[PDB]
Motif scaffolding. Sequence first.
Motif, PDB file in Angstrom:
ATOM      1  N   UNK A  45       0.810  -1.213   0.000  1.00 54.22           N
ATOM      2  CA  UNK A  45       0.000   0.000   0.000  1.00 54.22           C
ATOM      3  C   UNK A  45       0.846   1.266   0.000  1.00 54.22           C
ATOM      4  N   UNK A  46       2.105   1.187   0.432  1.00 55.01           N
ATOM      5  CA  UNK A  46       2.952   2.375   0.444  1.00 55.01           C
ATOM      6  C   UNK A  46       3.491   2.687  -0.946  1.00 55.01           C
ATOM      7  N   UNK A  47       3.987   1.669  -1.653  1.00 54.94           N
ATOM      8  CA  UNK A  47       4.502   1.886  -3.003  1.00 54.94           C
ATOM      9  C   UNK A  47       3.380   2.313  -3.941  1.00 54.94           C
ATOM     10  N   UNK A  48       2.185   1.742  -3.768  1.00 55.02           N
ATOM     11  CA  UNK A  48       1.051   2.145  -4.593  1.00 55.02           C
ATOM     12  C   UNK A  48       0.631   3.578  -4.301  1.00 55.02           C
ATOM     13  N   UNK A  49       0.799   4.035  -3.059  1.00 60.12           N
ATOM     14  CA  UNK A  49       0.528   5.427  -2.732  1.00 60.12           C
ATOM     15  C   UNK A  49       1.633   6.363  -3.204  1.00 60.12           C
ATOM     16  N   UNK A  50       2.839   5.844  -3.447  1.00 61.03           N
ATOM     17  CA  UNK A  50       3.895   6.664  -4.028  1.00 61.03           C
ATOM     18  C   UNK A  50       3.693   6.871  -5.522  1.00 61.03           C
ATOM     19  N   UNK A  51       3.152   5.870  -6.219  1.00 55.63           N
ATOM     20  CA  UNK A  51       2.879   6.029  -7.644  1.00 55.63           C
ATOM     21  C   UNK A  51       1.686   6.946  -7.875  1.00 55.63           C
ATOM     22  N   UNK A  52       0.654   6.837  -7.033  1.00 52.21           N
ATOM     23  CA  UNK A  52      -0.505   7.712  -7.170  1.00 52.21           C
ATOM     24  C   UNK A  52      -0.134   9.172  -6.957  1.00 52.21           C
ATOM     25  N   UNK A  54       2.851  10.358  -7.823  1.00 55.51           N
ATOM     26  CA  UNK A  54       3.545  10.707  -9.058  1.00 55.51           C
ATOM     27  C   UNK A  54       2.567  10.877 -10.212  1.00 55.51           C
ATOM     28  N   UNK A  55       1.588   9.976 -10.328  1.00 51.42           N
ATOM     29  CA  UNK A  55       0.620  10.061 -11.416  1.00 51.42           C
ATOM     30  C   UNK A  55      -0.239  11.316 -11.330  1.00 51.42           C
ATOM     31  N   UNK A  56      -0.387  11.898 -10.139  1.00 57.26           N
ATOM     32  CA  UNK A  56      -1.075  13.179 -10.028  1.00 57.26           C
ATOM     33  C   UNK A  56      -0.162  14.333 -10.424  1.00 57.26           C
ATOM     34  N   UNK A  57       1.127  14.243 -10.085  1.00 58.48           N
ATOM     35  CA  UNK A  57       2.074  15.269 -10.506  1.00 58.48           C
ATOM     36  C   UNK A  57       2.246  15.282 -12.018  1.00 58.48           C
ATOM     37  N   UNK A  58       2.150  14.116 -12.659  1.00 59.67           N
ATOM     38  CA  UNK A  58       2.200  14.061 -14.116  1.00 59.67           C
ATOM     39  C   UNK A  58       0.963  14.717 -14.715  1.00 59.67           C
ATOM     40  N   UNK A  59      -0.199  14.516 -14.086  1.00 57.63           N
ATOM     41  CA  UNK A  59      -1.420  15.152 -14.570  1.00 57.63           C
ATOM     42  C   UNK A  59      -1.321  16.670 -14.484  1.00 57.63           C
ATOM     43  N   UNK A  60      -0.671  17.185 -13.438  1.00 61.45           N
ATOM     44  CA  UNK A  60      -0.498  18.628 -13.308  1.00 61.45           C
ATOM     45  C   UNK A  60       0.310  19.201 -14.464  1.00 61.45           C
ATOM     46  N   UNK A  61       1.205  18.402 -15.046  1.00 64.70           N
ATOM     47  CA  UNK A  61       1.988  18.868 -16.186  1.00 64.70           C
ATOM     48  C   UNK A  61       1.098  19.025 -17.412  1.00 64.70           C
ATOM     49  N   UNK A  62       0.366  17.970 -17.770  1.00 65.64           N
ATOM     50  CA  UNK A  62      -0.459  17.999 -18.971  1.00 65.64           C
ATOM     51  C   UNK A  62      -1.737  18.811 -18.796  1.00 65.64           C
ATOM     52  N   UNK A  63      -2.214  18.986 -17.561  1.00 70.47           N
ATOM     53  CA  UNK A  63      -3.407  19.798 -17.344  1.00 70.47           C
ATOM     54  C   UNK A  63      -3.129  21.268 -17.622  1.00 70.47           C
TER      55      UNK A  63
END
Lengths: 94, 90, 50, 61
Positions: A45-52, A54-63
Motif C-alpha cells: 500500500x505504500x509503493x502504490x501510494x507513491x505512484x498515485x 507521481x501520477x497526479x504530478x504528471x497530470x499537473x503537467x499535462x493539465x
Amino acid sequence: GLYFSSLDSSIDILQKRAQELIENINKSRQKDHALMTNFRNSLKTKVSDLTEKLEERIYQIYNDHNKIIQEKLQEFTQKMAKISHLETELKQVC
Amino acid sequence: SSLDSSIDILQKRAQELIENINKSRQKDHALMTNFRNSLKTKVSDLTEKLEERIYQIYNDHNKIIQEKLQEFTQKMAKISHLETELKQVC
Amino acid sequence: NDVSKEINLMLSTYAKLLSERAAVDASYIDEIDELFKEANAIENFLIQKR
Amino acid sequence: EALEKDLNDVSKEINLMLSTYAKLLSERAAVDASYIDEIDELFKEANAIENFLIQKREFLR
C-alpha cells in the motif's frame, strides 16, 4: 530410593523441556507469519501510494500544458481573424 | 497575393501543429501504459522469488527439526529402557 | 530518483526481517542440541553403572 | 547467499528503470516546449503583419 527417583526427575524435566520447546516453535512461527505478512501487505500500500502521488504530478503537467496551448492558440486565432479582416479591406478599396 | 501566402502558411501550420500535439499525447499514453506493464511484471516477479526462498529456507529447517527431535525421542526411550532394567535387577 | 531510494531501503529492511527470523529458528535448533546433550550424559551414566 | 544476487538484480533494475523514465519525461517536456515556442513564433508572425496592416489603413484612412 534416591537413585531411581532423581533419574525419573531429570527425565520428567526433559519431557517438559521437550514439550515446552515444541510449543514455543508453534508460537514462534505465529509471530513469524503475523509480522512479515503485516509488512508485506504494508509495503504494497505504500509503493502504490507513491505512484498515485507521481501520477497526479504528471497530470499537473499535462493539465496546464493543454491550458497554456489552448489559451494561446485561442488568442492566435483572434489575431488571424483581425488580419484576414484588414486585408480584404485593402483589396476592395484599392 | 503575398499576404494571402503568408497567412495561408500561418493558418495551415496551426492546423499542422494541432495534429502534431494530438500525436504527442497519444505517444505519451503509450509510454505510460508500457511503463506500467514493465513495473507490474517486474515487482510481481520479485515477490515470487522472495517468497519461495523464505518458504524453502523454512522447508529445510522443518526437515532438520523433525530429524533431531525424532532422534531425541529415540534416545529418551533407550534411557527409560535402561532405567527399567536397573529397577528389575534391584 | 527519490522513489528508487525508498523502494531499495524497504527491501533491505525486508531482508533483515527475514535474516532475523531465520536466525531465531537457528537458535531453537541449538536448544534442541542442548537437550540432545543432556540426554547423552544420562545415558552414559546408566551404561557405566550397568 | 542466494538472496543476494537475486536482490542485487532488483535494485539494478529499478534504479535503471526509473532513471530512463526520468530522462523520458525530460524529452517529452521538450517536445511540448517546442510546440509552445512554435505557437509564439506563429503569433509573432501575425503580430508583425498586424502592425503592417494597421499602419497602412491609417495611411489611407
